[PDB]
C-alpha cells in the first residue's frame, strides 16, 4: 500500500543470499584448524541462516498481509544480521570467508532496516 516494492524485492534477495552465505560460513569455520575459537561465529551463522530463510518466505507472501507480523519478523532478521555481521567481522582476520560473510550480514541488516523504516 505505502510499501516500497523495490525495497521488498531487495530484502527478499538479500535474505536468500545472506542465508546461504551464513550456511557456507558455518561450514567454512567448522573446517578451520581454529574451529575451537570460532564456535560463537558458527552458532550465530546457524541462527542467521534460519532467520533469513524464514524472513525471505514471510516477505514473499502478499495474501492477507499483516504489518505487525512483517515488522516483528524484519526486526528479528535485522537483529540477527547485526549480531552475525559483528561476530564474522571479528573472525575476518583469520579467514577471508568471514570477511565476505560479514559483508553479506551487514548488507541484509541494511535491507531489513530500510524496509522496516517504511513500515
Amino acid at each position: 500500500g505505502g510499501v516500497d516494492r523495490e525495497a521488498m524485492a531487495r530484502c527478499i534477495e538479500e535474505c536468500l543470499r545472506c542465508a546461504q552465505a551464513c550456511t557456507a560460513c558455518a561450514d567454512a569455520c567448522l573446517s578451520e584448524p581454529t574451529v575451537a575459537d570460532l564456535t560463537k561465529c558458527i552458532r550465530t551463522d546457524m541462527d542467521c541462516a534460519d532467520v533469513c530463510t524464514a524472513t525471505a518466505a514471510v516477505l514473499s507472501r502478499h495474501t492477507g498481509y499483516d504489518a505487525n507480523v512483517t515488522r516483528a519478523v524484519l526486526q528479528a532478521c535485522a537483529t540477527v544480521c547485526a549480531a552475525c555481521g559483528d561476530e564474522c567481522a571479528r573472525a575476518a582476520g583469520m579467514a577471508e570467508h568471514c570477511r565476505v560473510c560479514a559483508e553479506a550480514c551487514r548488507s541484509c541488516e541494511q535491507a531489513c532496516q530500510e524496509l522496516l523504516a517504511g513500515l
Copy 2:
C-alpha cells in the same frame, strides 16, 4: 544464566508442535470447498510454520547465546502465533482443524511470552 530451562524446553516443544499444526492447517484449509474464504488463514499458517521452525532452532542452541537475538526471535514468534491464532479462531466454526490449530497457536504464543518475560 537467569533463564528458566523448563520454560525454554516448553517453548521449543511448542514451536515444533505449532509449526506442524500450521503446516497441517494450511493443507487442510487448502482442501476445503471454502478455500476461497480461507486464503488469509492459509497464508498466516505458512508464516506461522516458518517462524516457529526458525524459533525452535535458535532456542535449541546455547553456544555463544545472545539475549538480543533470542528476544527479537521470540517476539517475532509470539506476534505471528497471536495473528495466526486469531485467524484460525475466525475459521473455527467452518472446520474442527482450525479450532485445534487456533489452540496450538495460542499455546505457543503463551510459551514465547512466558520465556520473553524472563529475558
Copy 3:
C-alpha cells in the same frame, strides 16, 4: 574430489531462486479467483520450496561430505522440481506467475540432474 565445483555453485543458486519462486507462486495462486482449481499447484509449490531450501543448505556444506546423503537429497529435489514444473506448466495459461515458476522448477531440476550425473 571428482565433483564439478561450478555445477555445485549453479545447483545452490538455482535451489534458492526456485525455493523463492515457489514460495511466491504458492502465494500468487492463493490470491487468484481460480484458487479452487490451483490447490495441487499451491501444495506442490510448498513442497518444492521446502525441499529446495534443504537441498541448498546440504549442498553448501563441504565438511565431512557424504556422497550417499548428497545423492539422495539431490534426487529428492530433482523429483519435486519435476513434479512442480509440470503442475505450474498446467496453470501457465491461467497466470503468467505460473509460467515463470514452471521455468524456475525446470531450471532447478536440470541443475540437480547435472550434478547427480557427476556423482
Copy 4:
C-alpha cells in the same frame, strides 16, 4: 489410499523430534572441548535437521498427494538419518548427548523406512 495413516503420523512426529535432537546435538558438539574431532558429526546433524524439517512438512500435506515426491523425500530422510545415527554413535563414548541423538536418528530412519515400504 493404501497408506498407513498411523505410520504417517509416527514419521511426522519422529522427523520433528529428530530435527530438534540434531539441532541440539550440533550445538552440544560445538560446545565440547573435543569440537575439533566432532566436525563431521556437527555437519551431519545440520543436514539431518534440514532434511527432517522438510520431510515433516511434505508428509504433513495431503492435498494433491504425489507418491513419487513423497517416496524420494522419505528416501532422502532415511539416508541422512542413517548417516547421522552412525556418526553420532561414533561420538557416543565422548558425550551422552550423541548417544541420545544417535537413538533419535535410528528411530526416525526406521519410521521413514516403514512408511517407504508401504509406498
